[PDB]
């Protein structure tokens, strides 16, 4: 439909960079880039990788906060078939050691010089601070470098997304270009982001929750705001229209909102995943933001996302986490009839390429994804947990 099959991630950026070069693409605490600017910096970063001889298929590990440079790193890497491995700032050292070694990168990008030193303790790979490598990126940007394309297959890996905690063995979902682009397009076919949306994103891009607000905004030409007591004020002052949430962020927001009768009227949608959103939170979100839809979703990183409750149905089937993503199938398993509980299983062009270098773990979970969650489909195709 609007579903994209066989896509490359960086093509999302090239399109918007040509289609709306002068619209705002990314804002952070420090400034704003238009789509032209994001394209230029992404190209410049691609030349920096070329300059360092990082080849197609190799990984870079990037431990950065939510700032404009990280998005340019993501796209520039994509443009060279290099594998973006985003990690959250503040991981414990031993945890980093384990994950960096598993990811097996060509090099590592850190937040600043103190962080670059801590990283040097835990790997022998080359480690670059973002502020120092960025002086070069800007030179390259000024020289117009990296503008050329290179061969990248839709089947090539774009990203490894680590989901394992400290106390666990390292584990990353291995994400090819095509699946990513497909999943973004399918989510958006349900959610309806568009070019005048302003997305207020408080999730790290190291989580697929934030990564996909980068992708979905880029896909549609929207503006992404990379964002504590001031949350209400931030939302209102950014003119935010779309906001991904998790239940703890939504409770916080409803507490904060009662202290501020100016609200954040520009808000039109909250999209919840990751955990079950209680009714009381939903009610309080609608009360503070009567203009906004509160949309329930459910997913796993293994296939990005599984179900979305269509916005227009937000008041119905209160126990459901919605319908399958458009272009995908949910089956309950030996296929069971409707209403019969069983394991939630998922088939489609969003199902990712397994876990990175872990045939054994991959075998149990994976062309069909077994979520290890249990529930049923009602008569109409809607998904529920339990019975
Ligand atoms: C964020 C969710 C999760 O795995 O917790 C899922 N990746 C989703 O986007 O719906």
TrEMBL record:
Domain AMP-dependent synthetase/ligase: 31-356
Superkingdom to which the source organism belongs: Bacteria
GO-annotated molecular function: acid-thiol ligase activity
Name this polypeptide is given: Non-ribosomal peptide synthetase
Organism: Streptomyces halstedii
Interval of the full protein contained in this chain: 1 to 378 of 478
């Amino acid at each position: 439909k609007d579903l994209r099959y066989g896509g490359l991630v960086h093509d999302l950026l090239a399109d918007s960079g040509k289609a709306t070069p002068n619209s705002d693409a990314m804002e952070d605490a420090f400034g704003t880039w238009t789509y032209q600017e994001l394209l230029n910096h992404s190209q410049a970063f691609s030349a920096w990788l070329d300059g360092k001889g990082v080849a197609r298929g190799e990984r870079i590990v990037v431990q950065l906060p939510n700032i404009r440079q990280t998005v340019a790193v993501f796209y520039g890497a994509c443009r060279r078939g290099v594998v973006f491995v985003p990690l959250n700032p503040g991981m414990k050292p031993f945890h980093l050691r384990s994950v960096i070694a598993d990811a097996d990168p060509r090099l590592v990008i850190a937040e600043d010089e103190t962080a670059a030193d801590r990283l040097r303790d835990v790997t022998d790979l080359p480690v670059y601070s973002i502020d120092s490598l960025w002086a070069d990126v800007e030179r390259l940007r000024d020289a117009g470098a990296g503008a050329e394309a290179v061969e990248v297959s839709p089947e090539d890996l774009a990203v490894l997304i680590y989901t394992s905690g400290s106390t666990a063995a390292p584990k990353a979902v291995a994400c090819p270009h095509q699946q990513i682009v497909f999943a973004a397009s399918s989510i958006n076919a349900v959610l309806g982001y568009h070019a005048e949306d302003i997305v207020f994103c408080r999730m790290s891009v190291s989580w697929d929750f934030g990564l996909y607000k980068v992708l979905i905004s880029t896909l549609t030409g929207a503006k992404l705001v990379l964002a504590d007591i001031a949350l209400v004020k931030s939302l209102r002052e950014s003119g935010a229209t779309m906001m991904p949430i998790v239940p703890s962020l939504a409770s916080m927001l409803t507490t904060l909102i009662r202290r501020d009768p100016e609200g954040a009227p520009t808000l039109r949608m909250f999209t919840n995943s990751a955990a079950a959103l209680p009714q009381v939170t939903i009610d309080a979100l609608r009360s503070a933001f009567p203009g906004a839809q509160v949309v329930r979703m459910y997913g796993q990183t293994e296939c990005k996302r599984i179900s979305i409750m269509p916005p227009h149905l937000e008041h119905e089937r209160p126990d459901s986490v919605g319908l399958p993503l458009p272009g995908t199938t949910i089956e309950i398993l030996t296929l069971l009839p409707p209403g019969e509980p069983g394991e939630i299983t998922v088939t489609g062009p969003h199902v990712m390429a397994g876990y990175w270098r872990a045939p054994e773990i991959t075998a149990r979970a994976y062309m069909r994804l077994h979520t290890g969650d249990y529930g049923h489909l009602d008569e109409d195709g809607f998904l529920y947990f339990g019975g």
